[PDB]
Write a protein that binds this ligand. Structure first.
Ligand SMILES: [Mg+2]
Lengths: 426, 18, 848
């Protein structure tokens, strides 16, 4: 029971599934975006993610954002209403692909139902407070003739198009006064920059990724972020003291857990346990809050008991006969492992018979453009690129760059930024 | 010495021809 | 200066030490219901897909609420950085060495060079790490008629060069090695310089690492046991819990080592393997470019007369590359596991043994403090501790990763017998050192004679001693005995007048004891003895005793190979690869086997007693028959011939001659005749019931002389295929062995005469070794001349018609024989043919 809604970009605002939303990082300045509710609590805004970027960064320059990616730039991506509609329809199909097996359906169901706590660390234990940027976004109600009005909605996820680098998908949580609800047990609104057509390439014979798996990989981060278990512990960091050593970003355990397979072996058991204990400790803070919460100071129509009970179900707390909540360590343990170790790129790729990279540390090759994902000749909800009736199910032939030359285009090396080191003699 | 060798050679031939 | 572009992902990823948690150094509180924590990220995915407590049953509240009026939010700021980082270095490692093997798109006329400096200087010079011969052949320009033959040859030369896979010889105990890796990449400590194989024998896998990482190996924290005064039931649970927790600390430490291995060491080896793949592709590409340029220099007439398939050239080279990569991958994967098992895990085991010690102390004190509240049972719990902290937790990689590739390389490592070597004493720079990789301390005192043939002499002097202090962090004999000792020994003959003391006085030669338990090797006369002593003082021995009433002994004062193996049920002694003795040791309990090892003669010995030894090794498993026989054959190999005692055969050294097909026979110049008659050896003529031998220092005194200094001398060692003169001393003259040129019959007496140049006689002998099994015998071939293919005959003993007609008298002579020439080609080689000779020099270990 997950419903994927349909709509065209040019549909009228109906103030329900199609709205004018002011997203969190617009900082309440009256910048509203046309947003479409693809399912409960999950919104698509088919526009470029511009928050924190400069307008000129959207052009390829002599610079780069990320040292370990071949970055493709295209400032015109999503610049017409028809392009915005293609993105939206493509998202609809990707969500149906996800939904097409129970594992992906359950990912969507956990995300939908993992509503952020009505608060963060600054909120008194006795209070729900919806009046924070990690809980509520505003929508603009301004019907024909009648005056403009703002109302609030609870959301779980907002998916935008890409920032400057089309092929650099990212999931983002919200910090307020340097702390993050999504890392402290509360959860909070999650945002994603996503581009379905400009997918990554790897080898284990060079292959291209199924955008539905690329999307599911990001949704796992969303999932953690909503349950308040985004990891901030001891990261893997590169030694950078010698010229022959690779310089690269810190890697939190979560990235390796999320990929799955055998990469988490470099996360020590000691760190595995530090993270587990921190999460447990955060969830103990939540269960205490639920035992003490009396009022919602910001919204008088919030039924405390309905929310207590939804949060009980979210965190799998148990209720004694006199209504007190506690942590059953066995149900915590099952939830934790399901969230952190059940949903992984490796497990999902296996279940959907999708080919993916061998390791989180597999090399970044140039991405390729998928000609058309809405053409059921090339890509279907049920089978992705690996369609039996086109003779492409065998050995992920549909994803093979040699075999399925019709599915994709190469990108001109002129439009790709790539980091290089110049080792220079004297 | 030469002379020794020649006399020894004859002795060898007599051994070989037993 | 030259600038080289390098992708970020071809740099070496090496996690900084800051990546790793030191939480193991924290204290732990132990209580009656303390559990041991283990996180399994290996998840049953179908348990999730079926779980019906997972998806929420509760209805989603409505999304509608009040307007947001608090807009405080942190907004990320993103910024580009330059796409190119310029760094200045004059070092040449992988990046530079790979670049030297390329050439630009506007160059076609290339030559290979072994000079890395030339290859960087000139865009038509491409660096190659294959041999000078390969390089010369690839650079060779031929006429069109020869061209197709030159293609076949050089393409095949590429496949042979790429597949190269062995050291100087197997005596070094290196399982596999690809010798050109140093020259290909110059990774680590300038591995393109000097000899890679040799450097690898000395230092192992470490020489290939770009950076030796600093490991985090925390001192494990103290356990703090909770008192439950007047509660026996919960004091016992607390002890149990501390014991289960101790296992968790061992496990977490090993996990910590595995994480570092994978992200600081195995990453470096991965970069090396990728580098090698590229390097070999560059070599193939350069070869193809060369073959094309040369083909297209020919005219159209010439070109239509040459049949070559360019795709066939390509696939044959690619096939060569694939086989070479297999070897490289196995070698480097072995290096990576070696570094884990020898250089990382033991330092962990060291900290963990220290922690086990401290914990054992603590837990016994806590049982004391609670003796009253644990009446009677206190001693039972004390032995629960002592016992439980006895067996040291084995490292199993498959606990910390389920990566198939990692598990398979670990399994390969553990199924390779040379990786079971835990001590390997070898000669280096006038000393003995351990080359096992575990760094035993070896102290050789001044009374031990060493030489560069890896022989060492133990004498009766007080300072003739070697001490080896073994690495205490090596785990061997977990539960039951499972180890082996191998070495070569040379034991002198009894003194005839000292036979009673020889027979009765046992002396230790190698002693390895700790707390009155351990092992020793001892000798009593003609018996060599292996003794096990367990912790309770129970003793078992197995021995080999050679016969001292043999006319000619294979063992007395001759080098032979000993191997002792121990398993659950048996101690076995093998001699020269063959099982000699077996003792049932099922009754032996624990034997402490890592005490210091003392090599020293100890007992009631003659002042003049000595023992020589060579290639002492210890293995932490029971060697099979077939492992032992192979080791025997490997350690027997030499380019030089040997003398009767097993030492190298020398020019310009006096030797008596021994015949392996006529053991009791010797050569004497016949009276007033220039031929060698064959007589019967005299024998021990006194009356000890213990003793019989035939005399060895009899017959003519021979001496081997080098035919020419035409080639590099630099020593007096006789090598197989050398051309020699076989001379002997007749009174105060030097005479020579000749063959008369007219040789009509199958056998003919040799001519023993003064040194003299006669056209009627051959004087040149080629010394041979036809036997494929270990032997001290050689054969002596007369050929027409050095360069001739034609073989005249081998030196031997035959029976010649002497006299008589009704009864024919026959007599044995020193001869040349054509019959032996066919016999030596028959397989397996007949050890006992009369053309097999040994040279016996005077030796202090044989008196008669
Ligand atoms: Mg783990």
């Amino acid at each position: 029971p997950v419903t994927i809604n349909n709509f065209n970009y040019n549909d009228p605002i109906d103030n329900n599934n199609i709205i004018m939303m002011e997203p969190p990082f617009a900082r309440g300045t009256g910048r509203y975006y046309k947003a479409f509710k693809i399912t409960d609590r999950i919104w698509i805004i088919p526009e470029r993610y511009t928050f924190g970027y400069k307008p000129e960064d959207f052009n390829k320059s002599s610079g780069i954002f990320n040292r370990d990616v071949c970055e493709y730039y295209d400032p015109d991506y999503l610049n017409t209403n028809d392009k915005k509609n293609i993105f939206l329809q493509t998202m609809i199909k990707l969500f149906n692909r996800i939904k097409s097996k129970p594992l992906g359906e359950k990912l969507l169901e956990m995300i939908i139902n993992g509503i952020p706590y009505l608060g963060d660390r600054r909120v008194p234990l006795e209070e729900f407070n919806t009046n924070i940027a990690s809980v509520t976004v505003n929508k603009l109600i301004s019907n024909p003739g009648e005056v403009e009005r703002k109302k609030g909605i609870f959301a779980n996820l907002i998916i935008f198009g890409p920032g400057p680098v089309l092929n650099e998908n990212e999931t983002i949580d919200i910090g307020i006064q340097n702390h993050f609800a999504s890392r402290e047990g509360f959860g909070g609104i999650m945002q994603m920059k996503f581009c379905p057509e400009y997918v990554s390439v790897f080898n284990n014979r060079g292959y291209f990724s199924d955008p539905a798996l690329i999307l599911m990989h990001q949704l796992i981060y969303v999932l953690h972020g909503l349950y308040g278990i985004k990891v901030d512990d001891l990261p893997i960091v590169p030694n950078e003291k010698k010229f022959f050593m690779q310089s690269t970003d810190a890697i939190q355990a979560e990235e390796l857990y999320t990929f799955g397979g055998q990469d988490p072996s470099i996360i020590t058991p000691s760190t595995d346990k530090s993270i587990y204990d921190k999460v447990l400790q955060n969830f103990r803070g939540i269960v205490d809050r639920l035992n003490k919460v009396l009022v919602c100071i910001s919204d008088p129509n919030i039924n405390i008991n309905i929310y207590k009970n939804k949060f009980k179900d979210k965190y799998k707390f148990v209720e004694d006969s006199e209504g007190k909540y506690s942590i059953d360590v066995e149900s915590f343990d099952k939830l934790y492992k399901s969230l952190m170790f059940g949903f992984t790129e490796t497990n999902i790729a296996e279940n959907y018979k999708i080919k993916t990279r061998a390791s989180y540390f597999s090399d970044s090759l140039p991405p390729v453009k998928i000609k058309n994902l809405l053409d059921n000749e090339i890509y279907t909800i049920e089978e992705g690129f690996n369609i039996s009736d086109k003779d492409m199910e065998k050995e992920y032939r549909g994803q093979n760059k040699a075999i399925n030359k019709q599915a994709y285009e190469e990108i001109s090396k002129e439009h790709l930024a790539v980091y290089k080191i110049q080792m220079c003699k004297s | 010495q030469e002379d020794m060798f020649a006399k020894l050679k004859e002795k060898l031939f007599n051994e070989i021809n037993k």
